[PDB]
């Protein structure tokens, strides 16, 4: 049929028009203050350099020391939690990378482990949305008909719900401000991931607060639910279309 | 119905089954060489700071100066080819994180970009993945019935052979070695992406290298699109299950 052709050239074109779109955005918006910072960095680089009469070859000695202990300044970070915090964000793909395998063993375990683990969390987060969609779809009968304008709001609101609620914990367990921490739960939820900021990794969180721990692996796992939930009522609608 | 719920719970204690092992496995392999090197840095801290003659406050303002260069490093990023890989990595949800917004601007301009881009994103992937497998039936059958037998392996196989192309490449192009590029292309295409090894970042390639920078945008969004026709193929028969 000719319908599913003029679809996926019709998604092509608009997805390379989006990205051309954001990464004028981008652009406009970053190049500028990226050239500023990087003038001032290299201005006090040299300030401190001299002002301890440091050798090129020393600093550069001391930078790649810095450079390989920028991970540890979070003291240990393989332990049993977290290992486990990795691997959530290993099968979860969130990748942080913050704790990423260093031994070549290491490496390819974690390959192994994310080629079972990737699709058997998809199928777990599916099912358990399309749960708790017939659980909305349920209770919303029972406070009575029910419309995709009423479930949609219903999972929008949810949404909105787990964000609030998640910059509301972070910004007072890390100290972020609350967009800082709001920003956090959405790179997190959405599975980007950048790893900029990073939950658990002061104060030795990972052996000292168990409490907080546990907060943000369900957290993690059940902001990621509602979110598998929402993409189940709003897009599978569309994606499966071509097998119509 | 009591499956859709029985088959949910298995799922729910399968993957907790699956973050334990997880866990145990990679604390086992990686939390002795983690207190290791740990050390051994500590050590060599100490040396090149008495190497130096170096104040420990001189150091921490040395430390915070290194660690704000770090990304700089890797020149201007934040320009119309480095804003286009950024745009790749938020929609596509790699993340990297090698470039992230610096600005509270670029930072609410993120979250509308990624809110927008990543259902858009799914839906294209679903849709090209769903015509190349109707063209991989429609060819197979023309070199001969079909069956999942033939559909999975071919699948399989197109998977193995992008990871080796890519690993090929890369380790072509900017020197790591062949396992190490394999680790990366596996950790892209999962969009995992933890963002240790990061491509186009040495030799100013995002302003100097227009071929080497195509391929690999051209790379990333084919190799989602193979391994988006593979997880239709193998998860998207079990997951809508519940539909059933
Ligand atoms: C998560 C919330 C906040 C946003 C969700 C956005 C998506 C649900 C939207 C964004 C872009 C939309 C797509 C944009 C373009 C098209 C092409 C359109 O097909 C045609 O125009 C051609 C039809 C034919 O030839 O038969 C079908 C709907 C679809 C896939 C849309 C489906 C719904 C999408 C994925
Ligand atoms: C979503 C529903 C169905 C289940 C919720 C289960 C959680 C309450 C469990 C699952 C995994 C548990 C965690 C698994 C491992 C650990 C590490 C454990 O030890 C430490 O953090 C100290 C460091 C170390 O032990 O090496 C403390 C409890 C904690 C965070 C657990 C807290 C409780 C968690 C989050
Ligand atoms: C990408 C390649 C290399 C690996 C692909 C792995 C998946 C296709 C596998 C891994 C775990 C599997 C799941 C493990 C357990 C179950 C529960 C099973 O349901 C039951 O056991 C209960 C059935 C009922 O109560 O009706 C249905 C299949 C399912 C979802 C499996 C579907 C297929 C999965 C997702
Ligand atoms: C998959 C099929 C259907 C389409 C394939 C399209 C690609 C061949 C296009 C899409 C976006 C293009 C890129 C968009 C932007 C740039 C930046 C441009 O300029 C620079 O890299 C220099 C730095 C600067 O311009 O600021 C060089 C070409 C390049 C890499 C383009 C190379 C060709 C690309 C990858
Ligand atoms: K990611
Ligand atoms: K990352
Ligand atoms: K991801």
Redesign the pocket.
């Given at each position: 049929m000719?319908?599913?052709?003029?679809?996926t050239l019709?998604?092509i074109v608009?997805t390379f028009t989006y990205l051309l779109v954001g990464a004028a955005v981008f652009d406009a918006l970053e190049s500028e203050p990226e050239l500023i910072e990087r003038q001032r960095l290299e201005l006090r680089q040299q300030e401190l350099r001299a002002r301890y009469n440091l050798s090129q070859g020393g600093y550069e000695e001391l930078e790649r020391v810095v450079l390989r202990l920028k991970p540890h300044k979070a003291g240990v970070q393989w332990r049993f939690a977290g290992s486990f915090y990795f691997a959530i964000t290993v099968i979860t793909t969130i990748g942080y990378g913050h704790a990423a395998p260093s031994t070549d063993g290491g490496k390819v375990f974690c390959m192994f482990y994310a080629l079972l683990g990737i699709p058997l969390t998809l199928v777990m987060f599916q099912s358990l949305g399309e749960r708790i969609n017939t659980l909305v779809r349920y209770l919303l009968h029972r406070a009575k008909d029910v419309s995709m304008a009423n479930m949609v709001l219903i999972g929008?609101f949810s949404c909105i719900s787990t964000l609030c609620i998640g910059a509301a914990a972070f910004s007072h367990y890390e100290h972020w401000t609350f967009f800082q921490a709001y920003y956090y739960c959405f790179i997190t939820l959405t599975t980007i991931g950048f790893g900029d900021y990073v939950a658990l990794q002061k104060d030795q969180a990972l052996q000292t607060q168990p409490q907080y721990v546990a907060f943000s692996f369900v957290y993690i796992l059940t902001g990621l639910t509602v979110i598998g939930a929402?993409?189940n009522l709003?897009?599978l609608?569309?994606?499966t279309?071509n097998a119509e």
């Amino acid at each position: 049929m000719k319908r599913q052709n003029v679809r996926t050239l019709a998604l092509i074109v608009c997805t390379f028009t989006y990205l051309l779109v954001g990464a004028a955005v981008f652009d406009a918006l970053e190049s500028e203050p990226e050239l500023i910072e990087r003038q001032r960095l290299e201005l006090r680089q040299q300030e401190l350099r001299a002002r301890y009469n440091l050798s090129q070859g020393g600093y550069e000695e001391l930078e790649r020391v810095v450079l390989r202990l920028k991970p540890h300044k979070a003291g240990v970070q393989w332990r049993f939690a977290g290992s486990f915090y990795f691997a959530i964000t290993v099968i979860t793909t969130i990748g942080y990378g913050h704790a990423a395998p260093s031994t070549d063993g290491g490496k390819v375990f974690c390959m192994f482990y994310a080629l079972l683990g990737i699709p058997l969390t998809l199928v777990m987060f599916q099912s358990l949305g399309e749960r708790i969609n017939t659980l909305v779809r349920y209770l919303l009968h029972r406070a009575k008909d029910v419309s995709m304008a009423n479930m949609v709001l219903i999972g929008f609101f949810s949404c909105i719900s787990t964000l609030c609620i998640g910059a509301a914990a972070f910004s007072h367990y890390e100290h972020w401000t609350f967009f800082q921490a709001y920003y956090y739960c959405f790179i997190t939820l959405t599975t980007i991931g950048f790893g900029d900021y990073v939950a658990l990794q002061k104060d030795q969180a990972l052996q000292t607060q168990p409490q907080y721990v546990a907060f943000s692996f369900v957290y993690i796992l059940t902001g990621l639910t509602v979110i598998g939930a929402f993409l189940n009522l709003v897009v599978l609608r569309f994606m499966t279309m071509n097998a119509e």
